[PDB]
Write a protein that binds this ligand. Structure first.
Ligand SMILES: CC[C@H]1CN2CCc3cc(OC)c(OC)cc3[C@@H]2C[C@@H]1C[C@H]1NCCc2cc(O)c(OC)cc21
Ligand SMILES: [Mg+2]
Ligand SMILES: [Mg+2]
Ligand SMILES: [Mg+2]
Ligand SMILES: [Mg+2]
Ligand SMILES: [Mg+2]
Ligand SMILES: [Mg+2]
Ligand SMILES: [Mg+2]
Ligand SMILES: [Mg+2]
Ligand SMILES: [Mg+2]
Ligand SMILES: [Mg+2]
Ligand SMILES: [Mg+2]
Ligand SMILES: [Mg+2]
Ligand SMILES: [Mg+2]
Ligand SMILES: [Mg+2]
Ligand SMILES: [Mg+2]
Ligand SMILES: [Mg+2]
Ligand SMILES: [Mg+2]
Ligand SMILES: [Mg+2]
Ligand SMILES: [Mg+2]
Ligand SMILES: [Mg+2]
Ligand SMILES: [Mg+2]
Ligand SMILES: [Mg+2]
Ligand SMILES: [Mg+2]
Ligand SMILES: [Mg+2]
Ligand SMILES: [Mg+2]
Ligand SMILES: [Mg+2]
Ligand SMILES: [Mg+2]
Ligand SMILES: [Mg+2]
Ligand SMILES: [Mg+2]
Ligand SMILES: [Mg+2]
Ligand SMILES: [Mg+2]
Ligand SMILES: [Mg+2]
Ligand SMILES: [Mg+2]
Ligand SMILES: [Mg+2]
Ligand SMILES: [Mg+2]
Ligand SMILES: [Mg+2]
Ligand SMILES: [Mg+2]
Ligand SMILES: [Mg+2]
Ligand SMILES: [Mg+2]
Ligand SMILES: [Mg+2]
Ligand SMILES: [Mg+2]
Ligand SMILES: [Mg+2]
Ligand SMILES: [Mg+2]
Ligand SMILES: [Mg+2]
Ligand SMILES: [Mg+2]
Ligand SMILES: [Mg+2]
Ligand SMILES: [Mg+2]
Ligand SMILES: [Mg+2]
Ligand SMILES: [Mg+2]
Ligand SMILES: [Mg+2]
Ligand SMILES: [Mg+2]
Ligand SMILES: [Mg+2]
Ligand SMILES: [Mg+2]
Ligand SMILES: [Mg+2]
Ligand SMILES: [Mg+2]
Ligand SMILES: [Mg+2]
Ligand SMILES: [Mg+2]
Ligand SMILES: [Mg+2]
Ligand SMILES: [Mg+2]
Ligand SMILES: [Mg+2]
Ligand SMILES: [Mg+2]
Ligand SMILES: [Mg+2]
Lengths: 260, 178, 185
RNA sequence: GAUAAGGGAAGUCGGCAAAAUAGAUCCGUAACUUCGGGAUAAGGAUUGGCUCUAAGGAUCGG
RNA sequence: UAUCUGGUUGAUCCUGCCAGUAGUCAUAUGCUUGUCUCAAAGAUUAAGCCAUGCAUGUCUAAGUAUAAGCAAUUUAUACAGUGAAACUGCGAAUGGCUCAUUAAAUCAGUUAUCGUUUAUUUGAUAGUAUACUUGGAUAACCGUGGUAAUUCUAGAGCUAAUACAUGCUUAAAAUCCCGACUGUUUGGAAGGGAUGUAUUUAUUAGAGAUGAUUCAUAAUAACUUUUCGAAUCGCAUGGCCUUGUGCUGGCGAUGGUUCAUUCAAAUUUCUGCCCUAUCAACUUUCGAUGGUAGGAUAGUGGCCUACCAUGGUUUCAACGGGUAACGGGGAAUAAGGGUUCGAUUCCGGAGAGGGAGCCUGAGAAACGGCUACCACAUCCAAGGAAGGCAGCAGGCGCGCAAAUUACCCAAUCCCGACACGGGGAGGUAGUGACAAUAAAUAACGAUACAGGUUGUAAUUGGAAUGAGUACAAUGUAAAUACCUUAACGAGGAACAAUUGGAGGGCAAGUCUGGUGCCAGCAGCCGCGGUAAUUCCAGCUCCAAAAGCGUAUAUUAAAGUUGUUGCAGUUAAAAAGCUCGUAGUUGAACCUUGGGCUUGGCUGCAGCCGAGCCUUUUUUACUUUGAAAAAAUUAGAGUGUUCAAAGCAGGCCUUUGCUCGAAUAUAUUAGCAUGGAAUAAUAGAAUAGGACGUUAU
RNA sequence: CGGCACCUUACGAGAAAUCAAAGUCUUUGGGUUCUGGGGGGAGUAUGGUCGCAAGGCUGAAACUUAAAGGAAUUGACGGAAG
RNA sequence: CCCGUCGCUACUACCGAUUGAAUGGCUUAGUGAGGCCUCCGGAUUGGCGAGAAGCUGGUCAAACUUGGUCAUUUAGAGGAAGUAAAAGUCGUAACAAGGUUUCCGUAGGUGAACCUGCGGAAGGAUCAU
């Protein structure tokens, strides 16, 4: 109606932000950016609701206006900047590096990483095509455009971005046996290897994935993210739980043993 | 606006208002437990009716059903924890056999009277309401407080209460100060 | 104003539809350019997204292509001789797309004679280059005959009310024979 | 035999006399009905001149 | 709790309704009201009308400062700090409100854009064949004003830009076209043009991407009232000497073309809406269905135009009419199946008195924008001018029916040039028995009696406490309240519980007085004519209780709407009788049995799965899966002191460690998938039939 | 074999009278058409349609009402029989 | 026990001359504001260009008048009903073989119930000679 919306009602916010109902009428509307609104995590949510460094939105803005927060090695001062999957957030004042990777419960884990691993990131190739003057380029899942990619790189592949020069270190071809994290649907956050890709021309290709505990699930290729060349060899540190889904009874047993 | 806040009723009235058998059973049960009104009996019947409904729903499922095992064990565990269900009756078939007196046994007022801290059940209610009784190190003035098994041994007079080592109350201080 | 919405129409079953909402700006139309022939007059139109369209109200020349020869030249437009949509556009000389027009033949005749040497003082190398291009210099009779009148048949390919250009290609082959039959009748 | 400001039957037994309408094309047409009508009901639009365009045929030739 | 009870009769069994009964996130109203938490609230009738005030503004070192503003002399005589007014930029298209319109419309789920536009964010992307830096306007400002009146503005004099309008600076080649001359068997060439990117055609790659393209991209020939390839701003001030205002260069602001991305938008596939036939034919003049060409649009499309066909929908309910109809998530009630509701905390749509047309802009057919008409309506000096509360508060009116013209940006978020400003968005308090949670109005002894070692009935004591009041601290932007807490604060503990009833249904009097078929009661049956169990009262008792009653609607009861699941001989109801189209429904029959090996799970058997050997076309249905917003529902965990809730929280007390924020359900349609019973469908009958994998 | 019926019984049904269908219906599902939803107002008014007409077919509502009705029992009565 | 005219009171709906009346939507025709596009125009204002008022023709089209239609309310002399109230007048149609068995369809007649003809039914007063 006459133009873009600028507000986000609290109840209409993505559920994986884990916002409380009664704290207010509105929720942080993520800005336009590398990641989609529904699949992002604004820095205000990360710094106040997750890390609890800031006590309120005034404080998260005070933190970010002092140039502390970096996303993918670049300073961001937008409190609603849409950080997303595989993004690296650096707070060198506290000497902390985080990567936004889904945990098996469907949420963005607070996943601390070493400084050496915080120097790169992975990106799922969305499309490969030719730019002006016949220069090929790759579009990753976070909207990055890398020119002159390896001519072997195709869609659904994973590239390793140097994240300081923006170049491609090396890549992983999408194929059977590759380590995968699921980035959408009800299997979001699970980690396994590709068992069989079932093609459907004009429809949605389906990928069969086997967990490390030999559990098999099916998910859309659009929800499939290659993160490693084989089982047990991920190119990034996995969050606690290793993307292994436990039943609610198993979780209850594990909590009973963990707590006594 | 802000998201709505949930609320719900905790009782339900009988369909037939005047029935001597139910009226006599209710009055006998209220007299036994020193209850204020019939609504405190309706509340027990309501929550037992929905405990039974949940157990019946799980009992229609096959044994070894993941949902029956998970929610049945949780419901049994909760009832054993609050002392309503005995430790040798953890079968989800004795849950259906539960009765409102099992729940009224576990009220704070009943436990205060049965621990000897009060002369009668009506003394128990006024002791609770007048902030004399503490569970653990926390004062509880709600008579319907359902006492847990781990809380059973920690029911005693408040440390700052006249009956529990505190200073003398208003009346005594006014009498001995004149 | 002019609206392109489908709400005002009656359904495929014939039912009249009730009025759903007021006319929206994202479904507007505008008025035809009705491009004529005369000294160039072009008005810009501010379109959706801040983009620009050009109403050619009057044009004299255009870019016309000789497809077989692979050559394009800017030449005057003489008049409109045939229009498959409405004969009143022929009568009033209104330039739209797919209008059959007569274009000045001189730039193409000049290119042809300079390129091949025939009609419709040189060095030895130039004469040899022309001799090499010979044999391919024989064009269709129906096209050759027009050069006597100095005017070639062409069809407008651009949309003058959209781009301000009145461009086209020279009629050839059975398409030229087709419109020749249409013209003679 | 014509015309007439403003009003428009107040004239008169009574709209007597006069006025108004009027051809053609297209649109639209009520009650009632013996289903045949009523009906040109009622009520509307157009119409010149000029320059064009289109459609509608005959006899011969396989 | 899968429940019934009273009323037809002299009595009986039925049919059957009336009446009773319970709930309502269901409204109003009557009576009553002590505490804590939570909280709806001018929807219904009038999308009726509105006084007044507020609800949208906005500046960083980084666009423009000669304020004749303030401030200090300082690294500064171009400016330098702060900073009104103005120009410029951006926002004002979000939010908030309401539900009038709207019945294949909206909407829901599911699709598409190889059918488009897209400010902004985020990535990439431009060496292209006067320069030590171009012009002339204008505002603010000064001072002359005109009008009764407005956020009206007019002459005149200044002056700026990231405003406006123009304009150079550059690699190395190489390629193509014309081509004087020349070689002279077809080569060499001087000299001219053209190369980036945008636009528009025509002709060529495209034998890297897609399921698929005339896709991406490139090339050739041109075209263009020629797009833009920085005449901008802040901080640092470095390096090389050929010490000349020499040559070079660091972090940033802002901007810019195209592509991508993101926020969106616009169209769009399939299936699905309540009552009505006392609506059976509708659409097609003057677009109805389709074809061709064009115009227009951001783009597809009868969206519009011209020409041409005569199509398109319909008893499988079209079209018309009604709706006290915005749709959905949901709500009430619920054994199951259902019935009813959804103006209203979220999503989509629509509107801003009724229509219509536009400007600006990326985005509006915007109304706290404009223009005009209609209806209302304000000031007027009578010439004119200004309006739009279905935003917040408030008023009138309407009515059965709904609150303060309060405080604040502290939180949630949004907007802006932005760490700073603004926000009736939002939050806070006020009113508030809409609903919901918890929960006081007393407890315990001794005598005296009655009584069978203890339950009371009275007159005698000493304890206890919060309702209330208050220092104070906390809470809070500041308060209020809550939570804590000195001192005060209970015997008739007058610190006094009410609303309905006492014939039956239906729990509780055959007490006393009054009246006397009156007055009245009574949902229904009935009561009242002088001992009224029913009226009016006193006493007593009963039910629920800070709540209780009444009216209306709705749900259960209702197997009195019946698919589950009614009835039709006589209680209502088999068409007078046959035919008959749609619809519904339709006999049986086609791989069964046997054998061997093996995996798993239940306690030798049993139950599922397999794998071989035995001659070995279309659906419907059902399984599983993918994708399916939150809130609500169910449900796991968790001592909000309990609870309704909430999504918290827990650890020996932590310059930190640490479980969490589950899980189900949705269900028609679509998508993918396993199975082949059941029910359809097709095949080889004038053979135009099937196989020849390597038949000729 | 087909009909028109009848007699007995009640497995069964039914409120009963009664019923070989009015059975195989809470142990509720062979196929299908029509009709009813307390008594009146009322098969009335209105609209339509058919008919020459008489009328047929389709067909309400306001309002009103606690019964109307079915089968059977005992009695009372009968210008009914014995 | 009971039916129907007739009489009194009250209520509800109906018909009805009045080409009755009022309110709202849609629409033919006529008239037609305003914006937008277009066509010229050319106050004045820069060095040929910019350009205001206005003009031509279109386009979208509010709004008014008439007519038509749809929909919702409403007056009416008089006419003709229904129900409630009381059991007022006249009779006695039904319930018994109700004293002429009753009822159905149809058609006449009549203060009223009703009577009569024709053909049916038993729900008969006969399951039978
Ligand atoms: C010279 C002829 C005319 C002269 N004008 C002068 C103007 C005038 C004006 C009038 O009024 C404006 C008018 O009123 C009638 C009459 C006249 C006379 C009438 C006369 C002819 C007429 N004479 C009497 C009858 C008659 C019969 C006929 O057959 C016939 O045919 C030839 C003609 C006649
Ligand atoms: Mg909005
Ligand atoms: Mg696709
Ligand atoms: Mg006159
Ligand atoms: Mg006159
Ligand atoms: Mg007149
Ligand atoms: Mg007269
Ligand atoms: Mg007269
Ligand atoms: Mg006279
Ligand atoms: Mg007279
Ligand atoms: Mg006459
Ligand atoms: Mg006429
Ligand atoms: Mg009776
Ligand atoms: Mg309202
Ligand atoms: Mg409201
Ligand atoms: Mg309404
Ligand atoms: Mg209003
Ligand atoms: Mg309303
Ligand atoms: Mg309305
Ligand atoms: Mg913005
Ligand atoms: Mg087209
Ligand atoms: Mg077409
Ligand atoms: Mg319909
Ligand atoms: Mg409505
Ligand atoms: Mg509801
Ligand atoms: Mg709704
Ligand atoms: Mg609704
Ligand atoms: Mg709604
Ligand atoms: Mg709601
Ligand atoms: Mg909304
Ligand atoms: Mg709008
Ligand atoms: Mg408004
Ligand atoms: Mg308006
Ligand atoms: Mg607005
Ligand atoms: Mg508007
Ligand atoms: Mg307003
Ligand atoms: Mg208001
Ligand atoms: Mg309102
Ligand atoms: Mg009190
Ligand atoms: Mg009473
Ligand atoms: Mg009783
Ligand atoms: Mg008495
Ligand atoms: Mg008496
Ligand atoms: Mg009494
Ligand atoms: Mg009452
Ligand atoms: Mg019901
Ligand atoms: Mg029934
Ligand atoms: Mg009968
Ligand atoms: Mg009957
Ligand atoms: Mg029959
Ligand atoms: Mg038949
Ligand atoms: Mg069938
Ligand atoms: Mg069969
Ligand atoms: Mg028999
Ligand atoms: Mg028989
Ligand atoms: Mg009835
Ligand atoms: Mg109507
Ligand atoms: Mg008689
Ligand atoms: Mg008789
Ligand atoms: Mg007689
Ligand atoms: Mg007689
Ligand atoms: Mg006679
Ligand atoms: Mg006779």
């Amino acid at each position: 109606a006459r133009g873009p919306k600028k507000h986000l009602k609290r109840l209409a916010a993505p559920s994986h932000w884990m916002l409380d109902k009664l704290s207010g009428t509105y929720a942080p509307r993520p800005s336009a950016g590398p990641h989609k609104l529904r699949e992002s995590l604004p820095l205000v949510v990360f710094l106040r609701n997750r890390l609890k460094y800031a006590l309120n939105g005034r404080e998260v803005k005070a933190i970010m206006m002092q140039q502390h927060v970096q996303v993918d090695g670049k300073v961001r001062t937008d409190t609603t900047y849409p950080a997303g999957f595989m993004d690296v957030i650096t707070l060198e004042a506290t000497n902390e590096h985080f990567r936004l990777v889904y945990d098996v419960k469907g949420k963005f884990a607070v996943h601390r990483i070493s400084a050496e691993e915080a120097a790169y990131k992975l990106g799922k190739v969305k499309k490969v095509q030719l730019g002006k003057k016949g220069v090929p380029y790759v579009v990753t899942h976070d909207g990055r455009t890398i020119r002159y990619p390896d001519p072997l790189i195709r869609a659904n592949d994973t590239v390793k971005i140097d994240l300081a020069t923006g170049k491609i270190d090396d890549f992983i071809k999408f194929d059977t046996g590759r380590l995968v994290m699921v980035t959408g649907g009800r299997n979001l956050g699970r980690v396994g290897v590709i068992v069989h890709r079932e093609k459907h021309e004009g429809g949605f290709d389906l990928v069969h994935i086997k967990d490390a505990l030999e559990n098999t699930f099916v998910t859309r290729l659009s929800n499939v993210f290659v993160i490693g060349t084989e089982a047990g060899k991920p190119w990034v540190s996995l969050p606690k739980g290793k993307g292994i889904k436990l039943s609610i009874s198993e979780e209850r047993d594990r909590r009973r043993a963990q707590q006594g | 606006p802000r998201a709505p806040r949930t609320y719900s009723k905790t009782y339900s009235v009988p369909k037939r208002p005047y029935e001597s058998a139910r009226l006599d059973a209710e009055l006998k049960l209220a007299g036994e437990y020193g209850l204020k009104n019939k609504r405190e009996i309706y509340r027990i019947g309501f929550q037992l009716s929905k405990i039974r409904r949940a157990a019946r729903d799980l009992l229609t499922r096959d044994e070894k059903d993941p949902k029956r095992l998970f929610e049945g064990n949780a419901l049994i565990r909760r009832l054993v924890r609050i002392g309503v269900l005995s430790e040798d009756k953890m079968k989800l078939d004795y849950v259906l056999a539960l009765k409102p007196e099992d729940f009224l046994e576990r009220r704070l007022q009943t436990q205060v009277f049965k621990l000897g801290l009060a002369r009668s059940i009506h003394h128990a209610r006024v002791l609770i309401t007048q902030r004399h009784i503490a569970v653990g190190k926390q004062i509880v003035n709600i008579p319907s407080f359902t006492v847990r098994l781990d809380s059973q041994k920690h029911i005693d007079f408040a440390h700052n209460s006249p009956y529990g080592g505190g200073r003398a109350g208003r009346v005594k201080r006014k009498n001995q100060g004149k | 104003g002019i609206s392109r919405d489908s709400r005002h129409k009656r359904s495929a079953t014939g039912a009249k539809r009730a009025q759903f909402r007021k006319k929206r700006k994202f479904e507007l139309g505008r008025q035809p350019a009705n491009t004529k022939i005369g000294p160039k007059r072009i008005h810009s139109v501010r379109t959706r997204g801040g983009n620009q369209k050009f109403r050619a109200l009057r044009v004299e020349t255009g870019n016309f292509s000789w497809g077989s020869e692979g050559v394009s030249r800017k030449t005057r437009i003489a008049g409109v001789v045939y229009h498959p949509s409405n004969n009143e556009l022929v009568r009033t000389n209104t330039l739209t797309k797919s209008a059959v027009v007569q274009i000045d033949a001189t730039p193409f005749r000049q290119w042809y004679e300079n390129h091949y040497g025939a009609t419709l003082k040189r060095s030895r190398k130039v004469e040899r280059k022309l001799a090499a291009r010979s044999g391919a210099a024989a064009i269709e009779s129906a096209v050759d005959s027009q050069f006597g009148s100095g005017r070639l048949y062409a069809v407008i390919s651009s949309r003058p009310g959209q781009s301000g250009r009145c461009d086209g290609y020279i009629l050839e082959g059975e398409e030229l024979a087709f419109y020749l039959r249409r013209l003679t009748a």
